[PDB]
């Protein structure tokens, strides 16, 4: 196979500044590809990604003091500690495995990687180290990680487990912030993904929000096939059960602002919400919860998750009564009166759904004095009220 | 007529909410003064220490000083990541 | 160190503001927010304040006047107009 | 050849809501390769005019099938700009073809340029904010913009007619603010080679208006390029169009954006500095710039001029006649002054450019001694700011190696 051209890329990297050259000529893309390449099980062999990760070291040490050069050799020193350790992990799931004879001396020890992991979660902050982060194939590494410890160690309460599993998390975050690239790249780590989305069922409050973040970036402005993956590992109905179970008021702000994005991709999405026992009662029981920081922040994640699963729960009864019970309709003209853009443009598209098609509510719709509350909101300065508005406005003077 | 909420959906952020998780306080130096009018929000002037409490918003973070708290531009602050 | 107005890196990427100058034709900017700064060398202002753009090369900083007159500023501060006064 | 795709694509739009459910299995994408096909490899994927009238038609179908969402509004403003475009570029493509080849030209139809102008106009308006740039992203906007930049060029050369000049003017800001900060748009208009050759082109016309929009672009493309996009720059010479330009241009505002471009091309690789040095009386007026002060950012030129020579400064190391060059017109001399100047871009520059020039050369490093540079590299070693303080006390260690007297 291909084992040979990291022979031959090694090679090149070993005589006196030839390596210059070789980025010149796009090697570091080529050299990622074969020690994390899923550009689609394009990296290679142990000994050919031990190669590789060598030649990359070769290449980045061969520059002159600058800055950009010096950003580049911190950041891969934490990257090769990593690598290093992830091939650690790799040769014990091979020795600890189903056939395998296990009576032979190899555990590696998760204390050791979490210093190097702190470091690189805290400098993801940071925009230029971002950027190397991101050429020296940062993100892959970090995720690697991540999917190789929850594998060994699925859902443990050990504080030295959660703390890598928190930190790998953040930077994961960063990285995946406004990069369109590395949200694709992420979610195209199948296992990865599954790891990620299955830690929202662990017991630290502080873990399960550092998944939801994750989730949410990886669900704002996503490729199609990002969009597919999400959907196929459920993230969505995980999300929601865990936000059911939820304590904190801040895990809860994150978890709710994953799902408002998720909300928005299709009615397979919309329904899976639905689906879910409770959840329905829990989103209208968000819809007068007051945060303790950021007031509003819960009202508004709530009533725009509501707002977008408003369109499927307008052809089920059973999900109208659900709403009608935990006293949703009269819930959203209170949202009407509010001084906030963000709540009024949700109870008008939320109430835009529930008006049309059934008398059982747009009678009491009337009953409760809608007409008198939305005349004030067609005028307004923003279409998405105006319409919201107006459209419902028609559906009751439809039915007097 | 200000808004500190943007209504589109969930948006992106960094993890800037989860280095407050762990109990652990971060705060951010004053770039600029912030020079308002409105109780809802939180003036300040330059080289001012300010704890941000709620980074959730791209535009607009929650913050606290000894004096009181509000909202306040995220642009007019660089925050420190490290021991603080 | 003062406000550092450089960019010593390279000569980084920008949209096409200088662009709109280039016909002759005044580009404005509304401040959203009092830019308090007591450096001659920048230019102070008040919210709702148009500020006319004169060079806008670098991404952090951009020059502007008003009737007053012209320094330094931070474009966070302020949104452009693209089109007619 | 597979129109059947195309085909298959407008009976699936047919259906009135099920063109939802196509955006979400992911059709957009899918439909604009059909418009336009970037993803393909020179040597190894865009359909006819009768399966791109098929495509355009039910894109048209999806984005008008969702409700009036923000999106909504946005996207069907955006892609109706598109659809006048598109029909004016397969206009003067059936005018293109069957005009200029072979064939008998005996046919009744030339598209008019008028009509397009405020149309492209409301585009590169609309590509000022991020949110018209994202739907504008989603439609194949910049490639649409670029066709026809493209199609223009190569229909009136060099035209100086005003009504063609506002056109590519309008179109070429829309391609630099869509090239903003989009790592997948950069690399997409730089794939598109003849549009490419097009732009360079462009840098031969006497509006310096057009001039500076040009350079605007290649500034954004020749930023953090990835490693085919620096090489196609490379290979349409825009490096050589690009000083070749700043030499014979009078507005200092055109002069800003091209020596801007230049500086970021500069670092790319050894082949571009030696374009630069190759060009007659460019290595002179790089070190006119050194002392020329802008009427608006003052520092601006001076910036610029002084990173594109910090930049090549290694390769002129080497040449005597090029040290010559820099000797008669004052280097050395004002590098020094460069060093008391307030400004982190200017003074880093400096002593990286004495820095190159220190070494390897008894002539230079005479003067240096005899100018007194010791007391003022001495006065930098200790700097805040480390890339000064390494370049100063690197070029002093080049000077401390030779003094004549002590």
Same mark, same amino acid.
């Given at each position: ?73 911190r950041v891969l020193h934490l990257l090769e500690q990593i690598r ?51 050429e020296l194939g940062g993100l892959q590494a970090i995720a690697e990680? *991540? ?29 995946? &912030? ?103 009662? &829990? ?39 659900? *709403? ?77 | 007529? %200000? %808004? ?15 280095? $407050? ?12 003064? %912030? ?14 220490? $300010? ?34």
């Amino acid at each position: 196979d291909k084992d040979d051209m990291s022979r031959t890329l090694l090679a090149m990297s070993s005589s006196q500044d030839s390596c210059i050259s070789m980025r010149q000529s796009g090697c570091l893309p080529l050299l990622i590809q074969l020690l994390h390449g899923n550009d689609k099980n394009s990296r290679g062999s142990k000994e050919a990604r031990a190669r590789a990760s060598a030649a990359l070291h070769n290449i980045i040490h061969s520059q002159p003091d600058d800055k950009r050069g010096r950003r580049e050799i911190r950041v891969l020193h934490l990257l090769e500690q990593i690598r290093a350790y992830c091939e650690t992990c790799w040769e014990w799931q091979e020795a600890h495995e189903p056939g395998m004879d296990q009576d032979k001396n190899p555990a590696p020890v998760e204390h050791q990687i979490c210093p190097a992991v702190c470091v690189l979660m805290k400098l993801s902050f940071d925009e230029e180290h971002r950027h190397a982060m991101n050429e020296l194939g940062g993100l892959q590494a970090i995720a690697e990680l *991540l999917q190789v410890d929850c594998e060994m160690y699925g859902l443990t309460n050990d504080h030295y487990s959660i703390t890598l599993r928190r930190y790998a998390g953040m930077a994961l975050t960063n990285l995946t &912030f406004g990069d369109v690239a590395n949200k694709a790249t992420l979610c195209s780590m199948k296992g990865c993904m599954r790891a990620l989305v299955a830690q929202l069922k662990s017991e630290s409050e502080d873990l399960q929000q550092v998944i939801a973040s994750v989730l949410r970036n990886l669900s704002w402005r996503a490729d199609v096939n990002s969009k597919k993956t999400l959907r196929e590992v459920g993230s969505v109905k995980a999300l929601m059960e865990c936000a059911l179970e939820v304590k904190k008021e801040s895990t809860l702000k994150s978890v709710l602002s994953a799902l408002w994005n998720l909300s928005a991709h299709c009615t397979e999405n919309k329904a899976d919400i639905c689906a879910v026992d409770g959840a329905l009662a &829990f989103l209208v029981g968000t819809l007068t919860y007051r945060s303790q920081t950021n007031t509003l922040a819960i009202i508004e994640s709530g009533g725009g998750i509501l707002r977008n699963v408003s369109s499927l729960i307008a052809t089920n009864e059973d999900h109208r009564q659900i *709403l009608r019970e935990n006293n949703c309709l009269q819930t959203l003209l209170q949202h009407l009166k509010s001084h906030s853009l963000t709540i009024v443009s949700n109870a008008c598209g939320t109430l835009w759904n529930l008006s049309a098609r059934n008398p059982k509510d747009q009678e009491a719709l009337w009953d409760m004095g809608a007409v008198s509350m939305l005349k004030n909101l067609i005028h307004s300065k923003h279409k998405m009220i105006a319409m919201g508005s107006a459209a419902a406005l028609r559906n009751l003077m439809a039915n007097r | 007529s %200000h %808004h500190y909420s943007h209504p589109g959906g969930g948006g992106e952020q960094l993890a800037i909410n989860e280095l $407050i998780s762990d109990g652990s306080v971060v705060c951010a130096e004053a770039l600029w003064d %912030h020079v308002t009018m409105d109780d809802q929000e939180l003036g300040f002037k330059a080289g001012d220490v $300010i704890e941000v409490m709620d980074a959730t918003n791209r535009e607009w973070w929650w913050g606290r000083v000894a004096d009181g708290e509000g909202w306040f531009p995220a642009s007019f602050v660089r925050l420190r990541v490290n021991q603080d």
